[PDB]
């Protein structure tokens, strides 16, 4: 069983500019672990698989969260630290292109369709249960959990938004953009680490370790 109520509960339970953005990511990594612990059946996976799933998914998971948080704001993102980063600020720091991808492909789209917190929660839980993550002891169990999430998300969408039969697919079809943006963000992060001019705290640094 995979109740959307429990997924939304997990969401509500956890509620230069580049330096500020990196501090925010580190902060949210601690909170992400608590979020995942509240997603049904995650804690029952082998500890090594929980580690694999979180190491695989943390960036997409956290990007989805700050993007949805930012729907109330125009041309900016809202960090968990209470700081706002304006598009102009991101551009002036040399990271404008990737910032605009976040605004256009994620925030604006989430805004336009009025994606709700249950829907966000379920998309994130799908990202979490990524059965393609390398090294999983039982990929089939993770696949089964993902299937349970999207079965529950679709049922929710049909009941809450019956006037929008394409809504469930539209939610799922933000995932390629999320994947691409997560990968580009990670590339920047590795560069920041390489040049060494940007402080990176311990948990974010740990996530940048090789496996």
């Amino acid at each position: 069983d995979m109740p959307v109520e429990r997924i939304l509960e997990a969401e509500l339970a956890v509620e230069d500019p580049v330096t500020n953005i990196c501090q925010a990511a580190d902060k949210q990594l601690f909170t992400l672990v608590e979020w995942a612990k509240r997603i049904p059946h995650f804690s029952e996976l082998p500890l090594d698989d929980q580690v694999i799933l979180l190491r695989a998914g943390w960036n997409e998971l956290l990007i989805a969260s700050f993007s949805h948080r930012s729907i109330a704001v125009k041309d900016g993102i809202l960090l968990a630290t209470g700081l706002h980063v304006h598009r102009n600020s991101a551009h002036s720091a040399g990271v404008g292109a990737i910032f605009d991808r976040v605004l256009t492909e994620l925030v604006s789209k989430m805004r336009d369709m009025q994606m709700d917190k249950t829907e966000l929660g379920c998309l994130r839980a799908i990202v979490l249960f990524n059965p393609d993550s390398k090294g999983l002891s039982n990929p089939a169990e993770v696949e089964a959990l993902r299937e349970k999430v999207y079965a529950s998300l679709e049922a929710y969408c049909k009941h809450k938004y019956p006037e929008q039969p394409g809504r469930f697919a539209k939610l799922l079809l933000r995932l390629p953009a999320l994947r691409s943006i997560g990968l580009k963000c990670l590339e920047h992060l590795f560069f920041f680490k390489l040049i060494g001019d940007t402080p990176i705290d311990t948990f974010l640094m740990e996530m940048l370790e090789a496996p």
């Binding site: 672990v33 500890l47 580690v51 311990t202 948990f203 740990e206 370790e209």
Partner: peptide
């Protein structure tokens, strides 16, 4: 991955 393991334990 020491921080992650610690946090997952409890």
């Amino acid at each position: 991955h020491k921080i992650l393991h610690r946090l997952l334990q409890a």
